[PDB]
């Protein structure tokens, strides 16, 4: 059994190709503003209601976002294996392992492994650290593969799933605008 963190609906659509019997965990205080949080949570909720997935929605609140912030407020650098995005992702998966340890699941994972390739090493390193600290096994698979990716793209266009074009945080939204 496994608890899977959900980053976004596109990546959930890819992940269910490979693993459909998970409890899913949408927890993303890294997202600003709230209107973008809600639009993405409603994407996922659309996917879950259509495929009858078990999704649990974590906390989003002026507190939670603030724990996130100061947790990454020291760093000014973006990208895989940047310190900031390592503390970020580590914040999210820490909460997912916490929830999985509380609920008794044996393993945790994340739809972040449905993301481009080049991100897998950083996410695997974080997962293993977290595993060590909380005693929930980190499950690693490249979810893009075996056609899952273009399946999940197929359904994204058929179902009108919102596909975001920035990471989530205000830093990356400045980044996209450049
Ligand atoms: S802002 Fe960029 S690096 Fe910061 S958490 Fe979101 S995606 Fe990761
Ligand atoms: Cl992503
Ligand atoms: Zn995502």
UniProtKB/Swiss-Prot annotation:
Keywords: 4Fe-4S, Disulfide bond, Iron, Iron-sulfur, Metal-binding, Oxidoreductase, Queuosine biosynthesis, Redox-active center, tRNA processing
A single GO BP: queuosine biosynthetic process
Residues annotated as transmembrane: none
Entry superkingdom: Bacteria
Gene Ontology MF terms in the entry: 4 iron, 4 sulfur cluster binding; epoxyqueuosine reductase activity; metal ion binding
Amino-acid positions noted as binding [4Fe-4S] cluster in the UniProt annotation, renumbered to this chain: 7-8, 85, 88
Pfam families, A to Z: QueH
Pathway: tRNA modification; tRNA-queuosine biosynthesis
Catalytic function, reaction form: epoxyqueuosine(34) in tRNA + AH2 = queuosine(34) in tRNA + A + H2O
InterPro entries: QueH (IPR003828)
Residue ranges the record marks as coiled coil: none
Protein family (similarity comment): Belongs to the QueH family.
Name of this chain's protein: Epoxyqueuosine reductase QueH
Originating species: Thermotoga maritima (strain ATCC 43589 / DSM 3109 / JCM 10099 / NBRC 100826 / MSB8)
Lineage of the species this protein comes from: Bacteria, Thermotogati, Thermotogota, Thermotogae, Thermotogales
Gene this chain is encoded by: queH
């Amino acid at each position: 059994t496994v608890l899977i963190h959900v980053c976004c609906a596109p990546n959930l659509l890819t992940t269910i190709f490979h693993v459909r019997d998970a409890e899913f965990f949408f927890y993303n205080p890294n997202i600003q503003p709230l209107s973008e949080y809600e639009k993405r949570r409603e994407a996922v909720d659309k996917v879950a209601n259509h495929f009858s997935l078990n999704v649990r929605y974590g906390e989003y609140s002026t507190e939670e976002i603030r724990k996130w912030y100061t947790a990454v407020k020291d760093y000014k650098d973006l990208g895989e294996g940047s310190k900031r995005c390592e503390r970020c992702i580590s914040f999210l998966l820490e909460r997912t392992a916490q929830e999985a340890r509380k609920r008794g699941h044996e393993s945790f994972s994340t739809t972040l492994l449905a993301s481009p390739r080049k991100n897998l090493p950083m996410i695997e390193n974080i997962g293993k650290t977290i595993e060590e600290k909380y005693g929930v096994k980190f499950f690693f698979k490249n979810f893009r593969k075996g056609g899952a990716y273009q399946e999940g793209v197929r359904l994204s266009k058929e179902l009108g799933i919102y596909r975001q074009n920035y990471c989530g945080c205000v830093f990356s939204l400045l980044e996209r605008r450049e």
